[PDB]
Write a protein that binds this DNA or RNA. Sequence first.
DNA 1: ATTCTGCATGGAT
DNA 2: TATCCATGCAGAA
Length: 111
Amino acid sequence: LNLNIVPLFEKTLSASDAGRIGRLVLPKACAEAYFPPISQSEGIPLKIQDVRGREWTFQFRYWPNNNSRMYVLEGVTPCIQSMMLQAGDTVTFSRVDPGGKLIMGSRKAAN
DNA sequence: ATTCTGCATGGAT
DNA sequence: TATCCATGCAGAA
Ligand SMILES: [Hg+2]
């Protein structure tokens, strides 16, 4: 059958996202809009392939923030290093239709 | 000291 | 006023 890659959204890494803590923050709008919906704080494990085949597995989860939710992927440090990534570079998420498989990529900062 | 948690804050807009 | 995510910041180990 016929296949296509739908871009979902991107995230320009912050220091907090890029450093040692291992959590990459997702803006709520984007999280709820493009990832599986989730009803509990401690969310689900989420598998994302990269261009060169490799599956990564993060916990996709959130906490109560104000009267809403703040969202994150936990356990990302391996992947960031593997991709030689820093604050200011950018990660792009993307979906493959039909079937809705999640994949990812990144690019270096503008300089 | 250190890393991990689980939020809460407040700066930026 | 409001929103909200980058970073603070305390337990707990
Ligand atoms: Hg990654």
